[PDB]
Amino acid sequence: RSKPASENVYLKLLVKLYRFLARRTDSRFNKAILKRLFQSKTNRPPISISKIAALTSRKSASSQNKTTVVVGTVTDDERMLTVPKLSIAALRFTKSARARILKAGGEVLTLDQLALRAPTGSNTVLVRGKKHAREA
Amino acid sequence: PDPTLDDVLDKEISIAPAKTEVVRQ
Amino acid sequence: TFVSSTMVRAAIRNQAAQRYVNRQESKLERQVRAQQNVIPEDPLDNVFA
Amino acid sequence: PFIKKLAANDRKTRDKALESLQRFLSQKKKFERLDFLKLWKGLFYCMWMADKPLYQQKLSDNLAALVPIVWIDNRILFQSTFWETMGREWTGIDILRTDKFYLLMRRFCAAAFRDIQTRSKTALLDKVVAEYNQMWMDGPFNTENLAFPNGILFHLADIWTEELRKVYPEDVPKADWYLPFDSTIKSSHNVVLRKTLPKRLDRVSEYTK
Amino acid sequence: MAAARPTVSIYNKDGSVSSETLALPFVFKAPIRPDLVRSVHTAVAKNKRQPY
Amino acid sequence: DSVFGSTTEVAQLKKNYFLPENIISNADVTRLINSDEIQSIVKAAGPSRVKR
Amino acid sequence: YVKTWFNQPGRKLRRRQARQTKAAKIAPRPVEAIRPAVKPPTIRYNMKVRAGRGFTLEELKAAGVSRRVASTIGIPVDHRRRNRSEESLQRNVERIKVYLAHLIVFPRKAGQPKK
RNA sequence: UUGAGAAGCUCAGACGAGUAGGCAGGCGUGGAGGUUUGUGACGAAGCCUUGGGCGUGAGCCUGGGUCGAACAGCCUCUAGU
RNA sequence: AGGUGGGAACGCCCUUGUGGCGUGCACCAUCGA
RNA sequence: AUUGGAUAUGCCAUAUAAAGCGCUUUCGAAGAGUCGAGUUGCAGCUCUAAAUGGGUGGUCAUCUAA
């Protein structure tokens, strides 16, 4: 895969940014952020606001100042009642996720604002979503 | 952009007064 | 033996009884959480208004 | 009632409203931060809309010398609201316009160093730098607000010692001139902002302690 | 979104400007997509097609 | 502002309309690459079109 | 053997026209008469309320409208529906009693022989 | 040193038959929206040519003759292509 | 909304690296239900 | 020029009348060779009802065909 299958000309821009950041730096983060923007919509599955709040805040709850980063859509979970002070950076946020983070929490970022906050992608988590539909 | 059975079989709503003067005409 | 032959349909009719108010409560708790999820005002965009 | 004229589309109207702000701001009263955050959304656009390179580099000085017009109590409030409003919307610029919002930052960082020189003749500078340092500890160099971008502080390190020397040609005395940059590289969670900040800074340890 | 002119000069019937302005409407910061419009306008232009 | 509303506020002349947002926060991608956030960390550059 | 819907914009307007030509004659009085509020009969819908056919003979007697002066002033009657419970009766008196409160019948000239 | 249509530019190697089949980029025809401050009775389309030109090719551009009212390039949509 | 092994990435390292050290996404094994 | 339902108004009307709803120490008529059963391809043939009855649905509910 060498060019996104889409025609979203606000996503030729991101690829024009992270395929510059892939080759002028030594991070395999940018060679993993770029290696996901090419993937089709069924290959970038959604991930909820509860699985993100569960991934960072568990075991020792190491959630100090790391920005969760998913190249997908940050959807919502409403069975989660209280939302922790999180910070995410995805392409799309659903309008019930972006209003359930800001209501008590931190920052919602596009991968633009990520590249001006962690240009080499340090102090981050690079999560995915579950690809498993269990039959489809 | 715009900004209990005894009292119902006997009492009626009011005359519903008239606005814009043509339903008052 | 369980229930009579024709009276088993109650369990097939019963789901329908919920199915109107299934979507009806989920059309109102949806909006209730869509009422309380209003983003704050940020009195910075209003100065030019 | 005043700001929405500063964002006019006519330089004969924008500037005509700027000199009357000199009357409006030298008042002897108390101003609340948001009132200086709404006023600083006009002088952003008073400088965002700036045509010529021989006007915007004169407009910056007229904005720089606006600080000594502020009353003594809220003079440090007025710069704190600027560094917030020059760090809240620094990503919205493009390269054809950052070149002119760097010099506004260069002047205001230098305009701070000038006012410490003025305030140093009233009372000892050791407290004046500290409360100025306090303004640096809740504006840019605060750690907990990760949203303050790097491009501000990288340019804030390069102009820190050079416009300390510019306002103090004879000799700048010892104070906590670099204490913002030491508490920043020590615990701030922007990893590059603690790694490459010393590589940009030109700190002078001969006179500081 | 990023940053745009806040106030627009509102003109007169003679050609001269007027002192009163208005805020920039929030629609003018919306995405500019030369691709989505080509997909909708393609589909909306075939809605007054008389059959044959 | 009542037909399209804003990005976080409902358009008043449309039930359940919120203006969309962007996959890129700054609408200009060749002016982040040249910023001070990126060109401080990047590795030493090579040349342009190389010599034969 | 198809069912093509090319007239669907046209039946909309034809209905719209014939709903305006209905109102031409009845210019001061509504284009459709008041219908009661009756609860649907299945286990599924018995919590809903919707318009029905007409007011019963004892919904109408209790409101002061006889069955003969009923259909003059535009009040449908259902000689088949009956009021099993008070709630079916108290809800629909407050359909009539508001309707009579908001309605103004123009009077008429009579035929009393003189001399 | 300007060679940033980053869908561009540039450097170096290997390779080149091809059936059923699979994939990709393009050429042309009739109509539709947009565009060329588009061409046309000083001659549009067509047609003919021992004339010239381009492309690997489907094709296109043009000189001469004939002729007499309309017609084409570009980006999309569409098919009785 | 279970631990144990991998494993994407990211910190702190000091044997520069190597290696150590911590958090470990998807997916896969392992024993829980 | 033909025609609509209205509005006001003039003359006629025949009203010894007609109608709505209380109130009942009173009465309250209801469709057959059809219904129905048997039986041949809703029709044919044989047979042939009843008055809280008769029909269709779960002792009840709901309807009032010919």
mmCIF file of C-alpha atoms (C1' of nucleotides) in Angstrom, chain F residues 31 48-52, chain H residues 1-3 10-12:
data_model
loop_
_atom_site.group_PDB
_atom_site.id
_atom_site.type_symbol
_atom_site.label_atom_id
_atom_site.label_comp_id
_atom_site.label_asym_id
_atom_site.label_seq_id
_atom_site.Cartn_x
_atom_site.Cartn_y
_atom_site.Cartn_z
ATOM 1 C CA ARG F 31 3.485 25.049 7.138
ATOM 2 C CA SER F 48 18.546 17.532 -3.400
ATOM 3 C CA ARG F 49 18.552 15.518 -6.619
ATOM 4 C CA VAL F 50 21.803 13.646 -6.194
ATOM 5 C CA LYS F 51 24.890 13.883 -8.366
ATOM 6 C CA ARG F 52 25.504 11.103 -10.883
ATOM 7 C "C1'" U H 1 20.883 25.924 -8.773
ATOM 8 C "C1'" U H 2 15.403 27.871 -8.632
ATOM 9 C "C1'" G H 3 14.266 20.109 -10.501
ATOM 10 C "C1'" U H 10 15.813 12.913 -8.811
ATOM 11 C "C1'" C H 11 19.753 8.653 -8.335
ATOM 12 C "C1'" A H 12 20.914 3.292 -9.121
#
